[PDB]
C-alpha cells in the first residue's frame, strides 16, 4: 500500500508511514531482560521487555541498547525491536509496505548488508531502501544546498551537499554523541556526590541531561561565574524522591562536544570538524555552505548550541563571510521527516530495491544506491 | 622534620614516617562506643574506644566504621581516629611533620576538601597532600607502566598508567570490596547454622574470611566437588569455644568479586572491569598494560586470585598476547609503601600544599594536584 | 484430591484445605508433658499432650514449643504436632493430599530438607512445597508489588518484591517477635511486682500481651503521661481470680519492636530495618515500595502499630514521597490465605515436588524452588 519510514536511531527508534508530518510511534531502542528471581507465578512475566515497556519497569531490568554508535551489535535484539515496532507500534503487516531505513555515513558494509538481509528474509517487505541520515535531514530542511550536522545519539556525522551533489570526501564522522555525553555526565556527577552506575541510573542521568543541560556561550567565563558562588545551580528530583543539586555540571557535560579532550578523545570539536568539512570542499562552494548550515538530531537541542557554534565558526571562518546556522524546532525528528518526504516522492518510487532485484544479487545489491 | 604518610583505608588505618619500608602502626579504623550500663564506678571507663582497644573489648561496644567504601561518613569519628593515630600510635606532634594521605579515585571533591580543611585547621600540619591509591601502588611496585587493581576493604578501583601518563578516562571504580564480601559471607554462613548479626559477630566473620576464604580456579567444578561430599570442609573456632564447619561457603564468598550478581549488583566482575579499562586506553598501550598488571590491597590476598584473574583475562584477551599478573607478597601495605617512597622523593618536595598556599584560596586549593 | 496448606508458625499452627478463605484448624504449636506424679489410676493421663489439649491442662504440664525463631529444634515434637494436625484437626489421611508449607527467609537448607524428608517418608504426601511467608502474604494481599513485613511469633522478616520479582539481597530478617515481646513483658511486669516464671504463667503473660498491650504514637510523651498519674492503667484478671493492675508496662512491651535495645539487641527497630530494605532496592522501585507497604503476622495486630510505623517511615523517607501502609483485618491468617490462593492456582500445579522427583535426588531437591 503505502511506504513506511523506520529511522533506527541509536537510542530512539522512530517509525511511521510516509507522507505524515511526524513519526507515529517513538520509543527508546532498549531491550531489557529480568535480573532478579521470578518468585511470583501466574502474573505474566515475559523473558524480555522491549521498548517503552522496558523503560517503564527498568528497576528490575538490565537494559541493553542493540545499536551503539550507529552500528547494530546484537542482531537478535534488533530482530526483537523490529518485530515489536512493526507488530505493536505501527500495527501493520510488513509483507505489504515498503520500508525505508536510515544509516549513518562511513559505516561497515557488513552492518547494512545484514540489515537488508534480516529485513528482507525474516520479514517480507516487497521493497527496502537505506539512506544517509544527513541527506534525509537536508530533505526535511526544504533546501538543496548546505552542510548537515546530524548529531545523533551514537554518532555525529557531517555531510556537505551543494546543489544536490553530495561530496563523499569531505564527510567527517565523529563518535561523540548523546551516549558519550550521558556517560561523561555520570562520571562528573560523582564530583558533587551522586554516582549513577546501573543502567536504570544511566537512564536517570540521561533524563537529567535532557532536562537541565545547556551549552554556555563562553566556557571559561561561565565556569568562573559558577565557581564564584552564583545562582547557576539547578535542582532535580530523582524517582526515589530525594532532590539533588547540580552546580557547574550542567554546562560541562555538553561542552564535551566542543572539546572532545574531556573524555580523552583526540579529535577536535564539532565546530572544528564542521569547519574542516567546509574547507575540504571546492572553493566556490563554501559561499553557500557557510550560509546554509543545517542542524539535526535531538542532541543538537541543547539551549544555546546554535549561538555557540555560530560564534566558533565565525571565529574560524573569514570575517567577511556570512555564517548562518539553521536550527528548526523539529530538529529531533528532522531525519524522519526527510525520510517521509523522500519515500513519498514520485521520482523516488523507482529507486526501491525490489524483491526480484534482491533474489538475483544476494545481500549485496544494497550498494546499488549509496548516498 | 620528616614527612609522615597516613593511608586512611576503609577498615585498616596505616600510618608511619616516610622512608621506612613498612607502616609503623596498623590498627582497625573502628570507633566503638559502650552499649550497656556503666554499673562499675572507678574503672576509668572511657566514653569511646578507638582503634585496637575498640576491637579488644568489642563484646560491649557498637563498632562503627567512619569510612564506607573509601568515603568519610562520620567526620567526628575521623577526627577521633586521626587524633588517636597522631598522638598514640606514631606518638608525634603533627604541627611539624607534613602529612601525605591516600584517596580513592572518583571520590567527592567535598570529602577531600573537608579532609584537607580538618587537617589544616584542627591540626597544624605545615604541608599536606592527597594522592590516588593506585598511583602509590604503582610507585611501590617499582615500575612506571601498568594497570593497578587496588581492591581495598571499601572500594575496588582500577587506574591504568602508561609511561607515567595516567589515563583519567579508563579509570573504573567498583564498590565491591572486603566489606561487601564480609556481609555476603555473613548472609551465606546463615545457610549452615551461623547467625552472625551484631558488629562483633561481623568482625568474627571478617576473621573467618581472612583465614579460610580462597578463590577457586573454576567455580562450577569446585561447586560440584564440594557438593559431591569431598574433603573441601574446613573448621573454625569461635571465640566462645564452639567449632563451626564451613562447606562451600569459604570459596563462594570471594567469588562475588568475579560475579557481582551474587549480591544483586549489575556491574561485571573485577576481571571484566580490568579488561574493559585496558581496552579503553590507546591501541599501542596494551602491549605493556596486559604484561604489567599490578595488584594491591590485602583483599587481593585470597589464595589463587592471581591465577584465576590471569585465566579470565587470557580468555578475554587475544590469545597471542602475554598476560602477566604481578602479586607481590606485600600487597597489603603496597599503597603505604608507595606513599612512603613518593613522600621521600626529592622532586616531590616542591609539590606539597604549604600552609601559605592554603590560607589564601581556602579549602579548595587541593585541586592543584590531582592524579 | 485437593491440596492442603499447613503453615507451621512459631506458636500457632494453621492448617486447612486449599481454596478456603480461612484456616480450618488453629491451635498453639505446643507439646506438653506431665510434670507431677500419677497417683490417680484410670484417669487416662497420657504421656504427652499436644495442641489445644496441652494448653487446656497447662497447670500440670511443661509446655515446650518445638519451633523457636522460625527454626525447628525438636524434630520428635514437630513430628508429633504434624501427626496430631493431619489426624485430628483436618481428619484426612495425608497420603493423598499434596501439602504446602511456609518457611521464613534466610532459614535452613538443613531444617527445610529435614522437614521435606520427614513428610515424604514418615507421611506419604504425593507432593510438597515450601514457600516464603512474605511471598504468601503478598499473594493474599491481592497485589503484585510491595514490601512485606511479616512479624511472626518467632521471626520478623521483610521481603521487598517489585512486579513479582523479589530482590533476594534486600531481604532483612530480625529475631524480634512475639516470643521475645512476651519474655520482655514477663521481665518488666516485675516492676509493678507481678512476676510469672513457669511456662503456664508465660502463657498467661502472652494472653495479657494479646489483650492489653498496644503501641503508642510517641513513646516519650506516653511514658510521661503514664508517670504523671493519669488514667492509662488497665486491669487484668488472672485465672485464679486475682486482679492485677498494669501501668506503663502495656505500651512498653511492644515498644521493643521499634527499640530493640530494650533487651540488649544491637539491631535497629522494625521501621529502620524496613527503611533500609527499601533503600537497598533499585532507585526506580522505591516509588511503589513506599506506597505499597504490606503488614502481616499478629504482633502487627497491636493497636496503633500502623500509625507509628507510618510516622517513623515518613520521618525517615523523603518528605515528597507518599507513604501508605496496608494493614488488612485478616493480618493473623494472611500467610495461610496466600498459601491457599497459591496452592489453588492453575500455573502452580506443575511447580510441586512430586515423589518421583524426590526419590531421585534425595532430601536435597527442595532447592529446585526457592523464593
Amino acid at each position: 500500500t503505502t511506504a513506511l519510514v523506520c529511522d533506527n536511531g541509536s537510542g530512539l527508534v522512530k517509525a511511521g508511514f510516509a507522507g505524515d508530518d511526524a513519526p507515529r510511534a517513538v520509543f527508546p531502542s532498549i531491550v531489557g531482560r529480568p535480573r532478579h528471581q521470578g518468585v511470583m507465578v501466574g502474573m505474566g512475566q515475559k523473558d524480555s521487555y522491549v521498548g517503552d515497556e522496558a523503560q517503564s519497569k527498568r528497576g528490575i531490568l538490565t537494559l541493553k541498547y542493540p545499536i551503539e554508535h550507529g552500528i547494530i551489535t546484537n542482531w537478535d535484539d534488533m530482530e526483537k525491536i523490529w518485530h515489536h515496532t512493526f507488530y505493536n507500534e505501527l500495527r501493520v503487516a510488513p509483507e505489504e509496505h515498503p520500508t525505508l531505513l536510515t544509516e549513518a555515513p562511513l559505516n561497515p558494509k557488513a552492518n547494512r548488508e545484514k540489515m537488508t538481509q534480516i529485513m528482507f528474509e525474516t520479514f517480507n517487505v516487497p521493497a527496502m531502501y537505506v539512506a544517509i541520515q544527513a541527506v534525509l535531514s537536508l530533505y526535511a530542511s526544504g533546501r538543496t544546498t548546505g552542510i548537515v550536522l546530524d548529531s545523533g545519539d551514537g554518532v555525529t556525522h557531517n555531510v556537505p551537499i551543494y546543489e544536490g551533489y553530495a561530496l563523499p570526501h569531505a564527510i567527517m564522522r565523529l563518535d561523540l554523541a548523546g551516549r558519550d555525553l550521558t556517560d561523561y555526565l555520570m562520571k562528573i556527577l560523582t564530583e558533587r556526590g551522586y554516582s549513577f552506575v546501573t543502567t536504570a541510573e544511566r537512564e536517570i542521568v540521561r533524563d537529567i541531561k535532557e532536562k537541565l543541560c545547556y551549552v554556555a556561550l563562553d566556557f571559561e567565563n561561565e565556569m568562573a561565574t559558577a565557581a564564584s558562588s552564583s545562582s547557576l545551580e539547578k535542582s532535580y528530583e530523582l524517582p526515589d524522591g530525594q532532590v539533588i543539586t547540580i552546580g557547574n555540571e550542567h554546562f560541562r557535560c555538553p561542552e564535551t562536544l566542543f572539546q572532545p579532550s574531556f573524555i580523552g578523545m583526540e579529535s577536535a570539536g564539532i565546530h572544528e570538524t564542521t569547519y574542516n568539512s567546509i574547507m575540504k570542499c571546492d572553493i566556490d562552494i563554501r559561499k553557500d555552505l557557510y550560509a546554509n548550515n543545517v542542524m539535526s538530531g535531538g542532541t543538537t537541542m541543547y539551549p544555546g548550541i546554535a549561538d555557540r557554534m555560530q560564534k566558533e565558526i565565525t571565529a574560524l571562518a573569514p570575517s567577511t563571510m556570512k555564517i548562518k546556522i539553521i536550527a528548526p524546532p523539529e530538529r529531533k525528528y528532522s531525519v524522519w521527516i526527510g525520510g517521509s518526504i523522500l519515500a513519498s516522492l514520485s521520482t523516488f518510487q523507482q529507486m526501491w530495491i525490489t524483491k526480484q532485484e534482491y533474489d538475483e544479487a544476494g545481500p549485496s545489491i544494497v550498494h546499488r544506491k549509496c548516498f | 622534620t620528616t614527612a609522615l604518610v597516613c593511608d586512611n583505608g576503609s577498615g585498616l588505618v596505616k600510618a608511619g614516617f616516610a622512608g621506612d619500608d613498612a607502616p609503623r602502626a596498623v590498627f582497625p579504623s573502628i570507633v566503638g562506643r559502650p552499649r550497656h550500663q556503666g554499673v562499675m564506678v572507678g574503672m576509668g571507663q572511657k566514653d569511646s574506644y578507638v582503634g585496637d582497644e575498640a576491637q579488644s573489648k568489642r563484646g560491649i561496644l557498637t563498632l562503627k566504621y567512619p569510612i564506607e567504601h573509601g568515603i568519610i561518613t562520620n567526620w567526628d569519628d575521623m577526627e577521633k581516629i586521626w587524633h588517636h593515630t597522631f598522638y598514640n600510635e606514631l606518638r608525634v606532634a603533627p604541627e611539624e611533620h607534613p602529612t601525605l594521605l591516600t584517596e580513592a579515585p572518583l571520590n567527592p571533591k567535598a570529602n577531600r576538601e573537608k579532609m584537607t580543611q580538618i587537617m589544616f585547621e584542627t591540626f597544624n600540619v605545615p604541608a599536606m597532600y592527597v594522592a590516588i591509591q593506585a598511583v602509590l601502588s604503582l610507585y611501590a611496585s617499582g615500575r612506571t607502566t601498568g594497570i593497578v587493581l587496588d581492591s581495598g576493604d571499601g572500594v575496588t578501583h582500577n587506574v591504568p598508567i602508561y609511561e607515567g601518563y595516567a589515563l583519567p578516562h579508563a579509570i573504573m571504580r567498583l564498590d565491591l570490596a572486603g566489606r561487601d564480601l564480609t556481609d555476603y559471607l555473613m548472609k551465606i554462613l546463615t545457610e549452615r547454622g551461623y547467625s552472625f548479626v551484631t558488629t562483633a559477630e561481623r568482625e568474627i566473620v571478617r576473621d573467618i574470611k581472612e583465614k579460610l576464604c580462597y578463590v577457586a580456579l573454576d567455580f562450577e567444578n569446585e561447586m560440584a566437588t564440594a557438593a559431591s561430599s569431598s574433603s573441601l570442609e574446613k573448621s573454625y573456632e569461635l571465640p566462645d569455644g564452639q567449632v563451626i564447619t564451613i562447606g562451600n561457603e569459604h570459596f563462594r564468598c570471594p567469588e562475588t568479586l568475579f560475579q557481582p550478581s551474587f549480591i544483586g549488583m549489575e556491574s561485571a566482575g573485577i576481571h571484566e572491569t580490568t579488561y574493559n579499562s585496558i581496552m579503553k586506553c590507546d591501541i599501542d598501550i596494551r602491549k605493556d598494560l596486559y604484561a604489567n598488571n599490578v595488584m594491591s590491597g590485602g583483599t587481593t590476598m585470597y589464595p589463587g586470585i592471581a591465577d584465576r584473574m590471569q585465566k579470565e583475562i587470557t580468555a578475554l584477551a587475544p590469545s597471542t598476547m602475554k598476560i602477566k599478573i604481578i602479586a607481590p607478597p606485600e600487597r597489603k601495605y603496597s599503597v603505604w609503601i608507595g606513599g612512603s617512597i613518593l613522600a621521600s622523593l626529592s622532586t616531590f618536595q616542591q609539590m606539597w600544599i604549604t600552609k601559605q598556599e592554603y590560607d589564601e584560596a581556602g579549602p579548595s586549593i587541593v585541586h592543584r594536584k590531582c592524579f | 484430591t485437593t491440596a492442603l496448606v499447613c503453615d507451621n508458625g512459631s506458636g500457632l499452627v494453621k492448617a486447612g484445605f486449599a481454596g478456603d478463605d480461612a484456616p480450618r484448624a488453629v491451635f498453639p504449636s505446643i507439646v506438653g508433658r506431665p510434670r507431677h506424679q500419677g497417683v490417680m489410676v484410670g484417669m487416662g493421663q497420657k504421656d504427652s499432650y499436644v495442641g489445644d489439649e496441652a494448653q487446656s491442662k497447662r497447670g500440670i504440664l511443661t509446655l515446650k514449643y518445638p519451633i523457636e525463631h522460625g527454626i525447628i529444634t525438636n524434630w520428635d515434637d514437630m513430628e508429633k504436632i504434624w501427626h496430631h494436625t493431619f489426624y485430628n484437626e483436618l481428619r484426612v489421611a495425608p497420603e493423598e493430599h499434596p501439602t504446602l508449607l511456609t518457611e521464613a527467609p534466610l532459614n535452613p537448607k538443613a531444617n527445610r530438607e529435614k522437614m521435606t524428608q520427614i513428610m515424604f517418608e514418615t507421611f506419604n504426601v504425593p507432593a510438597m512445597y515450601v514457600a516464603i511467608q512474605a511471598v504468601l502474604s503478598l499473594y493474599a494481599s491481592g497485589r503484585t508489588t510491595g514490601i512485606v513485613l511479616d512479624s511472626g511469633d518467632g521471626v520478623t522478616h521483610n521481603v521487598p518484591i517489585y512486579e513479582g520479582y523479589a530482590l533476594p539481597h534486600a531481604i532483612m530478617r530480625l529475631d524480634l517477635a512475639g516470643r521475645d515481646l512476651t519474655d520482655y513483658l514477663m521481665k518488666i511486669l516485675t516492676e509493678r511486682g507481678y512476676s510469672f516464671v513457669t511456662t503456664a504463667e508465660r502463657e498467661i503473660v502472652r494472653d495479657i500481651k494479646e489483650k492489653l498491650c498496644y503501641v503508642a504514637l510517641d513513646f516519650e510523651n506516653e511514658m510521661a503521661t503514664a508517670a504523671s498519674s493519669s488514667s492509662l492503667e488497665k486491669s487484668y484478671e488472672l485465672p485464679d481470680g486475682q486482679v492485677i493492675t498494669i501501668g506503663n508496662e502495656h505500651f512498653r512491651c511492644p515498644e521493643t519492636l521499634f527499640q530493640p535495645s530494650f533487651i540488649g539487641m544491637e539491631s535497629a527497630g522494625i521501621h529502620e530495618t524496613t527503611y533500609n530494605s527499601i533503600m537497598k532496592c533499585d532507585i526506580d522501585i522505591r516509588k511503589d515500595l513506599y506506597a505499597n507497604n504490606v503488614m502481616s503476622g499478629g504482633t502487627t495486630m497491636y493497636p496503633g502499630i500502623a500509625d507509628r510505623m507510618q510516622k517513623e517511615i515518613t520521618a525517615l523517607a523523603p518528605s515528597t514521597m507518599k507513604i501508605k501502609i496496608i494493614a488488612p483485618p485478616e493480618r493473623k491468617y494472611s500467610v495461610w490465605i496466600g498459601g491457599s490462593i497459591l496452592a489453588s492456582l492453575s500455573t502452580f500445579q506443575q511447580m510441586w515436588i512430586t515423589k518421583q522427583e524426590y526419590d531421585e535426588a534425595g532430601p536435597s531437591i527442595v532447592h529446585r524452588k526457592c523464593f
Binding site: G193, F196, L238, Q242, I244 | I71 | -
Partner: peptide
C-alpha cells in the same frame, strides 16, 4: 554518597 548508594 548523597544520591545513589549510602555514603
Amino acid at each position: 554518597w548523597x544520591a545513589x548508594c549510602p555514603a
